[PDB]
């Protein structure tokens, strides 16, 4: 109960089986392009790629899944800071706009409040885990 | 007819036992699939076949 949010998040796996370097992007409400997941994680707070890895893969004895994450880490690598990630949501105007979308329109169930940035990040990773899970045919 | 019924009932039975055989054999990884089919696809044909032979 609360208007009844029509917003649906799509987490996509670009490229097919046999296509070199498969990237994972996600469509966020009210921002036209589908931005790489590593940028989202950095925009949420998780900045080192390996803390971002730890959010998707819950086992570090699973190289098959991690190898599938390697190109996505490379894609996101252009942006290394949280503020530089919020900016990559098109200054100061595009940064507050970004800040607002992740709170209000990105995963509005769970919470729309504030500091729950971690909760949304683990959830994002859960979705990405369940995505790569059918990609491996597991 | 009564005896005819027993005859029908055991026709099903002998065909269900014929399935069980092909099932536990395919579980024991001994089956060989006829081209353009998985072991699974090839197995399922046999099941369907024994049970349709049976009904008829």
């Amino acid at each position: 109960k609360g208007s009844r949010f029509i917003s649906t998040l799509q987490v996509k796996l670009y490229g097919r089986e046999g296509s070199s370097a498969r990237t994972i992007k996600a469509t966020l409400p009210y921002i036209k392009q589908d931005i790489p997941i590593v940028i989202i994680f950095r925009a949420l707070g998780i900045i080192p790629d390996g803390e971002i890895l730890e959010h998707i893969c819950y086992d570090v004895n699973d190289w098959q899944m991690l190898e599938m994450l390697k190109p996505c880490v490379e894609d996101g690598f252009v942006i290394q800071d949280r503020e530089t990630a919020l900016d990559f949501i098109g200054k100061e105007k595009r940064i507050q706009y970004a800040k607002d979308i992740l709170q209000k329109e990105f995963l509005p169930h769970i919470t729309q409040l504030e500091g729950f940035e971690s909760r949304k990040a683990f959830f994002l990773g859960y979705m990405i885990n369940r995505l790569l899970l059918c990609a491996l045919d597991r | 007819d009564g005896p005819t019924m027993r005859e029908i009932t055991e026709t099903i039975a002998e065909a269900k036992k014929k399935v069980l055989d092909v099932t536990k054999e395919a579980q024991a990884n001994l089956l060989t699939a006829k081209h353009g089919m998985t072991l699974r696809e090839s197995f399922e044909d046999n099941v369907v076949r024994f049970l349709n032979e049976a009904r008829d």
């Binding site: 080192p48 390996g50 190898e67 045919d137 597991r138 | 579980q27 024991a28 998985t38 699974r40």
Partner: protein
């Protein structure tokens, strides 16, 4: 493959070649960190897969009522207590081999009469 991360900033490690001493190094592009590669293997493909068949064999596997029980005695503890699933690999191509987990030793053994498996 089993790749490492750059200490100090836990970022991904990228390869670099030390053409002088002809050895592989793992360089960091989020700083000045470097480290000798252990293995000469940098990347692995694996088209034909054998990993995903024994998927989710938690301790509570024997508690699942939705699972079937059999009479097959254990190869190590020798208990006639079983819970078995089909090859958990969700590919069309997959075979219907059974994977029996014992309700005592909690060790997995198959019905396969072709391969000398140890996983």
């Amino acid at each position: 493959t089993t790749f490492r991360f750059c200490r100090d900033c836990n970022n991904m490690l990228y390869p670099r070649e030390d053409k002088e001493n002809n050895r592989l190094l793992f360089e960091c592009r989020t700083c000045s960190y470097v480290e000798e590669a252990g293995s000469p293997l940098v990347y692995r493909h694996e088209l034909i897969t054998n990993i995903g068949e024994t998927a989710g064999v938690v301790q509570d596997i024997g508690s699942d009522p939705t699972l079937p029980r059999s009479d097959r005695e254990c190869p190590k503890c020798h208990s006639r207590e079983n819970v078995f699933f089909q090859s958990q690999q969700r590919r069309k191509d997959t075979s219907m081999v059974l994977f029996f987990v014992c309700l005592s030793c909690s060790h997995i053994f198959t019905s396969d009469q072709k391969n000398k498996r140890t996983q």
